[PDB]
From a paper:
The SARS-CoV-2 translates its genome into polyproteins that must be cleaved to release individual proteins essential for replication of the virus. Given that Mpro processes the majority of these sites, any intervention that stops this process, such as an inhibitor, would block viral growth. The crystal structures of inactive SARS-CoV-2 Mpro, with the catalytic Cys145 mutated to Ala, with 9 substrate and 6 product complexes were determined to sub-2.5 Å resolution. As in previous apo and inhibitor-bound crystal structures, Mpro crystallized as a homodimer.
We used 12-mer peptides, P6-P6’ (with the scissile bond between P1 and P1'), in our co-crystal structures. The binding mode of the C-terminal residues (prime side) was more varied, especially beyond P3’ position, and lacked full electron density. In addition to the fully conserved P1 glutamine, which is stabilized through multiple molecular interactions, the large hydrophobic residue at P2 was extended deep into the S2 binding pocket in all structures.
Numbering used by the authors:
A (entry chain B), B (entry chain A): 1 to 305
C (entry chain C): 52 to 60
D (entry chain D): 192 to 200
The structure:
Amino acid sequence: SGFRKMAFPSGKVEGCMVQVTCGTTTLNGLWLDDVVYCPRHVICTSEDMLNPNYEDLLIRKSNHNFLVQAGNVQLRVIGHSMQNCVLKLKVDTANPKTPKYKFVRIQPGQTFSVLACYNGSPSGVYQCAMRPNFTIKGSFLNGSAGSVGFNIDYDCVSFCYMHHMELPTGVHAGTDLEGNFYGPFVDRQTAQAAGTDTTITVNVLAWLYAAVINGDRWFLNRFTTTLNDFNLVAMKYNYEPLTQDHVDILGPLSAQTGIAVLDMCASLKELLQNGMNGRTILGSALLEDEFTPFDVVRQCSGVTF
Amino acid sequence: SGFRKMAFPSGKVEGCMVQVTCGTTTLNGLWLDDVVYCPRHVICTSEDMLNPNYEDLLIRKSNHNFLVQAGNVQLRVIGHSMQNCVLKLKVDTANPKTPKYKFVRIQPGQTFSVLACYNGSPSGVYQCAMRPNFTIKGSFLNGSAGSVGFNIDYDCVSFCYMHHMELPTGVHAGTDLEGNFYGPFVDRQTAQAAGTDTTITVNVLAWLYAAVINGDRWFLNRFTTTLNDFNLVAMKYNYEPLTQDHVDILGPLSAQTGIAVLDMCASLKELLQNGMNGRTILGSALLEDEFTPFDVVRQCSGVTF
Amino acid sequence: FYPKLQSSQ
Amino acid sequence: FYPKLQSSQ
């Protein structure tokens, strides 16, 4: 029993973190095979982060302008190039700790684990969701760029996020590992703003299922509703529309609990209009939306790696 | 910016996790040097769950009745003994992955990371606190016994918790790594109940300081309080009494924010009286008490390991 | 309910 | 306030 915001174990990623320094600018890199990946803004000095010309900044750099440190070992850089907003620094030794991995691009509503790092060393690990507005509600400080988000499946690390920057509301923006930004953001410090966010409906439902799995059954009711009638309500409270696909993905949870999804949707409807009535669910006075259905199943069935 | 329930990087503990089977009973063990530590109820059958005499159950076992697996490798047990509620299995090989480590017994209110495992394999990592009533609000299933909780000090792992059992409210109880239970719980399945729990006040205050450091001041007020008047109020909300040592512990956050500890105490008295009135603090609609003053400084400054 | 020792069978 | 690229100096 119990339900926690659970991150993936981080050892496989921990062995890939390095530090990259260019001039007086330092951030983290990801060392896989004989390549180190890091945000291209490592080639900025403090004074050119407003409107950097990354092409021009990189052409005047050579290999020896990049200092790459792995623990107490300097890695020798033998090649450099830009792929979208990531620098690929070719080094002369392949990382012997390289795990089985893939680069994947995730969709809004999906979750991942973040290994937050500074100077190539971990500060900690936490669980995030890709918001519908393509930001991440991270915990990041100056020097954290190049930290990565990931998921594990069996023995394969799927890298999905590399951290770049913090938006004025204090939320975060970054790229996939091919350097493509999530959301309509750019790696420079001209005025930018996160757009209006919405709640990840299918994830709240997954969370209520987790609550029932843990005996928090008070919000269950003798009522029912339809997918259409639910979505009229959810739209009023700034929830994403629930699609039939979302229902299918909520299947293993509805099968394991004996509660049909639309029955759970009925309880969620009552929760939105009347509120929780001073009660809590799984230790929260908010409706949690950063657990996917698979996160619930993974946690409540004890899936390992 | 941002603030998350952040766990320690798990890699060093991942490399110590093994599987221990006696008969048809399996759980996890911790392999440090040439000793595997595990909960003693691995020697129980389904018939030994209510009133086991562990001394008697143990004398009937030989070294080869303990099957220890480290990944795909079976470890040869050459000795066994009981120390309180843990078994120590001496094996014929020292763990090549043993980190610098210590065994510590923590106090209620202190936090740690849990690496949740099944069959000697990691499922996930999450952050926990030793509750004032000596339970932990973990996430654990059948087979999770022998999972450990820990803190890191740059390169030294301090093991503070070994998981043993779940109580009927769905909270958990376990031991230090000397096999002494936290709280008045015992490793049998006769009736046991956690006492009434209280809120960890020093931690709520640290978390309020984290809110200020992240730019939020809406909850402060113009009052102060005496320590005794603060405790007379807070205790009506089932909060633990604040001691002067707690006040001293909060000195650094007080000094960094310019808010005297008893002035933040006045803010807390008002937040308890008012609730949040539709606001959230660091993304929560409840006052969070599983961050210590040290957790706050560590996450808001970027301490690494 | 009763407490549960969380080995597995 | 403006966006910040979160390298260090």
